Structure formats: structure tokens, C-alpha cells
Curated annotation (Swiss-Prot), chains A, B:
Species in which this protein is naturally found: Vaccinia virus (strain Western Reserve)
Enzyme category, top tier: transferase
Family stated for the protein in its record: Belongs to the class I-like SAM-binding methyltransferase superfamily. Poxvirus/kinetoplastid 2'-O-MTase family.
Annotated residues for binding of S-adenosyl-L-methionine: 39, 66, 68, 72, 95, 97, 116, 138
One GO CC term, this protein: virion component
EC number: 2.1.1.57
GO molecular function: mRNA (nucleoside-2'-O-)-methyltransferase activity; RNA binding
Subcellular location as annotated: Virion
Family annotation (CDD domains): capping_2-OMTase_Poxviridae
Region (Binding to Rap94): 163-291
Protein's name according to its UniProt entry: Cap-specific mRNA (nucleoside-2'-O-)-methyltransferase
Effect caused by changing residue 58 to S: Complete loss of poly(A) polymerase stimulatory activity
């Protein structure tokens, strides 16, 4: 067995303290181990992000604009969670594909069937005005060309929507497929437990203070770094059993999940963090039909 | 006569401490009082900016890429000034119009006859590599549509060229001609002595630290503010005679010029700042053929 002792998991990209030459053979390996693992991956990250905004007092009264929301099964859990906590939030879910019918019939959630373009963004901004907007983007076209285009669309979402905060899908193009340097919003590169086995994808989390917008350039050397750091995380770290992690499941991803869940707020009071987390996890897995 | 006592002039936009409702009638008033006033306006601002970079040790060894450089008569003075000071700089002047022939025959200055587009910017960047680039932009198409387009081109200059510093032409669209909010690089809004009588134009000066790029949104309310602050500056301030300004010319613009010139470095040592400034001014006016 692959056992180890860890104080805390790698929460953000910058924390990864080692790297490994990427082995293309890893692409042929089992990408997922749990049913609806993708819904779980998203639910944890979005719960983490939104709980932070709550902590900073910027969630209540906002409209969450989620672009690339379909099917969005897990979004129903998110909605119920904050709705039951007493937080007042309107949800606007936009995607050209159809949403899970469990999202229908809720006065607080609007489902829109539209692929957004710059022009459309302008009209929703005018229509949402004067509400404060929290943006969540999970759009997907892939080629580096598709990526750059998705990233360019994401930056235009922020400029036009002018959100108080945002969570954006972020996966750096692979070095051997570099095209050109580009900019992405400045934010924390949140790491994702339950991401596919060898996924280099993370979520860019940003909070907008003032009327400024900070961006950061991304170069091929950065792309080389992302590949090696993420490969080391996937191949070595995520394959560890944290034996000093007293929890029903000691695998790295549950240890990582634990740390995200411990930040989440609840109505019910627990005698320990372990009690809260086990409850949240149980609740999440049951909702998603994960054994 | 319109007399007053001033400690220092308004150096940057933020310093303007009052505002006045814009009177459209002012557009019919004499815009310029000195021959080649436009060359003088540019020469002072660019000398100010470049002396700052020298002060910060980032000028020597750079290539100044000036886009919208033609005719560029005043650029010959700038070049001679730093060339005689011992600073090693290469100049690359690009414009689709022809440059003043006084710029020819200098190994350190390259004249290019080309209207730059994003594609061209990429090729010059690849060709200038690995030199550090200082960008100066004075491109002009006008309508708010022309402006936005010029500003969008300027942001692309910075992203592609990735300069260590930049000086950009900056005039906010007029409120009654607003189209949409937009972003411009973060920088100091340098005020310009000898700008046309009622001009609302300034120069955005930026120094790039790290691999970040900070932008700032500009709204119609900001456009309303620019109009009133600049109108107050033009109508009231610039029309003042600074009687406690012991100098051959006590008009506001000479008082303002004085402060810019006092920052400029020289080979010759002077017993007073007044002596240095009078010398620099004399030298500048003689070069430009201004009585
Ligand atoms: N311009 C655009 N506007 C809206 N949705 C877009 C888009 N481009 C792509 N998409 C959507 O991006 C989605 C990627 S998969 C998204 C999964 C979803 N976040 C979940 O929770 O299940 C697809 O449904 C696709 O239709
Ligand atoms: N894309 C572009 N590339 C280069 N020059 C451009 C341009 N668009 C406009 N211009 C130039 O912008 C200039 C505006 S006037 C510039 C005056 C010059 N800075 C001086 O010192 O005299 C014109 O010469 C025009 O040809
Ligand atoms: C995950 N990954 C791939 N799938 C291909 C290249 N490099 C990489 O890190
Ligand atoms: C200078 N100016 C104009 N020329 C027109 C409108 N508002 C303004 O400040």
C-alpha cells in the first residue's frame, strides 16, 4: 500500500512542492473511480468558493450567474444548502444544453437555454442591474485554440458583467501545443479533489475590490511548470493513503475533501469538525447517488 | 490681469481640486498660442517620462518603440538629449506617414513606414527579442468609436510587446457621446502643459513590475468627472499668472513646464534649478524654432 503522513493537503497550485516529467502513458490510465465523479468535483469546489464569499459577507443578496451550467445536477444541492441556511441568492443558469429537471420549479433559479456571446452578456448585465453578480464559469468547447478562445470569453464575462467575485475553469495549454502567451484574471488557483486521475485543471477564484482588474500573463515556460507540478500531484500525491488521517477513508482525495468541507457552514451544531465533515460528505454522496 | 500665488502646479489628474460645468462655447476659442505648440507639448511629456525611467534605472539599454511617431520633429531633440548624456537607447519609430528627415541617418534610430496591427506587433516583438521595450504611443484615427478602437489597440501593444514601461495617449470620451465602459492600463495620468487651450488629453504613464497587468474600468460617470475637472483646469487654472513665480514668463504653462524640466538630467552643472530650467527651455525653444 502507498502510505504517508500529511499535515494538510495541497490547497492551491503554488503549494505543490515538487514536479515530475510528464509521462504520456498516463493518459491511457483509468480517469475516474466514482460514479458522477464530475458532479462531485464541481460541487466541492463551488461549495468551497461560495462559503468563502459568505465568510466575506458578499454572498447574501447576490445573483449567481453560472455559464456552462448544464446538466448541473450538483447545482441543486448547492442551491438547497444556501437556501436552507437563510442566505438569499438568485441563480441564473445559462447553457445551450438542457439542465437536470430537478432544477425546475424554483422561483429563485432561472434556467436559460442560450450559448452566451459578448452581445448577450451585455443584455443580461443591463437586465440584472442593479444586482451584485457572482460569476461561475464552466464553459467547454480540446485544442489550445479552443482553450484560448474559452479563456478570452471568460475575461469578457468579467469585464462586461463586472462581478464581485468569480470562479473560472482553468487548465493551462500543454507546452508541446503552445500557440501564444495570454492573460487570465489574477486569483487563487484552487486545487480540485476528485478531478480526473491525470487532470491538470483547477479553478481560478477571484474577489473584485475597487474598480480595478488585475491580469497575469501565461507563457510556455509557465505551461511547462503546470504540466510537471500537476503531474507530480496526480501521479504521486493523489495516490497516497494518509494513514494519520482518522477518517473512514484515508485516500488523499478524502483528506483533501475534508479540508474543503471543514470551511462549509451548517445549521446543525457538531461536537467536532470530523462530525461536521462526515455529515456533509454523507449528505453530498447520498444526494449524488455515490455509494 | 489674472494673478495668483501657487506652491506647485497640478502634475496629475487626481490633483485637480475643483470642477466646472463644461461650456461648449469654449470649443470656438483659440486653441493654440505658440508655433509648433504640439511638438512642444509632446517633447515636454516624453522628456518627463523618460527622465523618470532613467531615475529608476530602466532606460539604459532599452529600445523605445514609438507608434504614431510621424512627423516626430521633437523626437530628434529627445534622442540627442539622451545620446549626449551617454544613455544607450535604440529608437524604433513606426507610423504610416513620413517622418521629419532630421531623423534619418542615425544608426540608433530606425524609421518604419507601417500602420501597426496586432499581427505586426507580434513580428516586431519576435524581432526585438531579447531587448527590453519602452512603449510610447501617440496614435490617432474623433468619434468615441475611433477612441475606443485606439485604446483597444494600445492595450494590445502592451500585451504583445510586454514593455517595461509605457506612455499612452489618453483622452476620455465625452459623456454625451458615451458608448460603453472600457478598460485602460493603470498608470499616472500626467497633465500636459501647452496642450490645446481646452484639451482634455493627458498621458498615461506606466511601469511594469512582475508579470502582471493591472487595468481600470472607465465609466460614463468617470467621463463626466474628466470633463468637469479638465474644464476647470483649462478655463480657470491655465489662465492664471503665477506672480510668485520668479521666472521670465509667469503664465501657468511655464510654471507647469518648470516643474517638469526640473526633473530632467543634464551634463552641465548649474548653481540653481532656475538656471537649469532656463537653459533647458531656451534649448528646447531654439530647437523647435519657437521665439
Ligand atoms: N458560450 C457558452 N455559453 C454557455 N454555455 C456554454 C458555452 N460554451 C459552452 N457551453 C457549455 O459548457 C458546458 C461544459 S460541461 C458543464 C457542466 C456543468 N457545469 C455541470 O455542473 O454539470 C456544456 O454544457 C456546454 O454547452
Ligand atoms: N496603427 C497605427 N500605427 C502607426 N501609426 C498610426 C497608427 N494609427 C494612426 N497612426 C499615426 O498616429 C499619428 C497621430 S499624430 C502623431 C504625432 C507624432 N507623435 C509627433 O511627435 O509628431 C499619425 O501620424 C498617424 O499616421
Ligand atoms: C495531462 N496532460 C495531458 N493529458 C497531456 C500533456 N501533458 C499533460 O499534463
Ligand atoms: C473639451 N470638450 C469638448 N471639446 C467637448 C465636450 N466636452 C469637452 O470637455
Amino acid at each position: 500500500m502507498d502510505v504517508v503522513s500529511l499535515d494538510k493537503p495541497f490547497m492551491y497550485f503554488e503549494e505543490i512542492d515538487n514536479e515530475l516529467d510528464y509521462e504520456p502513458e498516463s493518459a491511457n490510465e483509468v480517469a475516474k473511480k466514482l460514479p458522477y465523479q464530475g458532479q462531485l468535483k464541481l460541487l466541492l469546489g463551488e461549495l468551497f468558493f461560495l462559503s468563502k464569499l459568505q465568510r466575506h459577507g458578499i454572498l447574501d443578496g447576490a445573483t449567481v450567474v453560472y455559464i456552462g451550467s448544464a446538466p448541473g445536477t450538483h447545482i441543486r444541492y448547492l442551491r438547497d444548502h444556501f437556501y436552507n441556511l437563510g442566505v438569499i441568492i438568485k441563480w441564473m443558469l445559462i447553457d445551450g444544453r438542457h439542465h437536470d429537471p430537478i432544477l425546475n420549479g424554483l422561483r429563485d433559479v432561472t434556467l436559460v437555454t442560450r450559448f452566451v456571446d459578448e452581445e448577450y452578456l451585455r443584455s443580461i448585465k443591463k437586465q440584472l442591474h442593479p444586482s451584485k453578480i457572482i460569476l461561475i464559469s464552466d464553459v467547454r468547447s480540446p485544442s489550445t485554440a479552443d482553450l484560448l478562445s474559452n479563456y478570452a470569453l471568460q475575461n469578457v464575462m468579467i469585464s462586461i458583467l463586472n462581478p464581485v467575485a468569480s470562479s473560472l475553469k482553468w487548465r493551462c495549454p500543454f507546452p508541446d501545443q503552445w500557440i501564444k502567451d495570454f492573460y487570465i484574471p489574477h486569483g487563487n488557483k484552487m486545487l480540485q479533489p476528485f478531478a480526473p486521475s491525470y487532470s491538470a485543471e483547477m479553478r481560478l477564484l477571484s474577489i473584485y475590490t475597487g474598480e480595478n482588474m488585475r491580469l497575469t500573463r501565461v507563457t510556455k515556460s509557465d505551461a511547462v511548470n503546470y504540466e510537471k507540478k500537476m503531474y507530480y500531484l496526480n501521479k504521486i500525491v493523489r495516490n497516497k493513503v494518509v494513514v494519520n488521517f482518522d477518517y473512514p477513508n484515508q485516500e488523499y482525495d478524502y483528506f483533501h475533501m475534508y479540508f474543503m468541507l471543514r470551511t462549509v457552514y451548517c445549521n446543525k451544531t457538531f461536537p467536532t469538525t470530523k462530525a461536521k465533515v462526515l455529515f456533509l460528505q454523507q449528505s453530498i454522496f447520498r444526494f449524488l447517488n455515490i455509494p
